[PDB]
Amino acid sequence: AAGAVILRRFAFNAAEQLIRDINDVASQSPFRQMVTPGGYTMSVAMTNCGHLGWTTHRQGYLYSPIDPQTNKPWPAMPQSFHNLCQRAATAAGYPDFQPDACLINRYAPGAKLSLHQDKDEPDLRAPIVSVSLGLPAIFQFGGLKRNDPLKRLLLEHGDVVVWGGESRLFYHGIQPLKAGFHPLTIDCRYNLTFRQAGK
Numbered sequence: 001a002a003g004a005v006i007l008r009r010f011a012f013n014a015a016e017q018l019i020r021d022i023n024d025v026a027s028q029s030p031f032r033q034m035v036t037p038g039g040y041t042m043s044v045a046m047t048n049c050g051h052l053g054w055t056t057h058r059q060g061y062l063y064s065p066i067d068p069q070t071n072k073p074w075p076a077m078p079q080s081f082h083n084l085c086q087r088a089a090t091a092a093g094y095p096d097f098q099p100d101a102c103l104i105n106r107y108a109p110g111a112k113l114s115l116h117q118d119k120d121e122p123d124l125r126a127p128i129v130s131v132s133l134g135l136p137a138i139f140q141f142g143g144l145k146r147n148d149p150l151k152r153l154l155l156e157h158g159d160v161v162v163w164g165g166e167s168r169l170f171y172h173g174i175q176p177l178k179a180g181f182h183p184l185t186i187d188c189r190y191n192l193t194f195r196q197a198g199k
């Protein structure tokens, strides 16, 4: 899509370390399946690291310094996360990107992410950096309207997408995860999305 940059296998050499750091983050702020304000439990399990974390609070979504499950700050952003995000963001031409939030998604087979926009960040000029690890997933994206036609791209282990420019506000999602196996993740896919969430 216009504005979006795909860097295939950009995070391949870093994957092992990133996965260790995911485990470390989740040991402090555990993965949970958040409940939408619609009352549905998501198939995707989530957690956050960094100064701010995306979560549900009082039947709604927000960036918060505190993990509502633990009542403690989200774990600090791992070095591996920060390094890889910056190498990706710079390669795609976003030198001033300074992320302070990393949402971590975990997909078991069957798990999917419904069509949505990321429009909750203060500056929409800032991109989102997205890192795929483990099992491959079909990423779908449309446009500015919920009913716009979808295009599909397979995202694989180590792929990084820098989601900026025109595509920044496009609706997008993930199709039900095909069952499979990966040496590093076992039977799941992880996705990291780095954001400038602070005002």
Ligand SMILES: O=C(O)CNC(=O)c1ncccc1O
Binding pocket: 105, 113, 118, 128, 129, 130, 131, 139, 161, 163, 172, 173, 174, 190, 191, 193
């Ligand atoms: O790949 C996922 O599991 C979900 N990714 C996203 O929701 C996303 N959002 C904004 C920009 C890039 C993304 O990959």
Ligand SMILES: [Fe+3]
Binding pocket: 116, 117, 118, 172
């Ligand atoms: Fe998204």
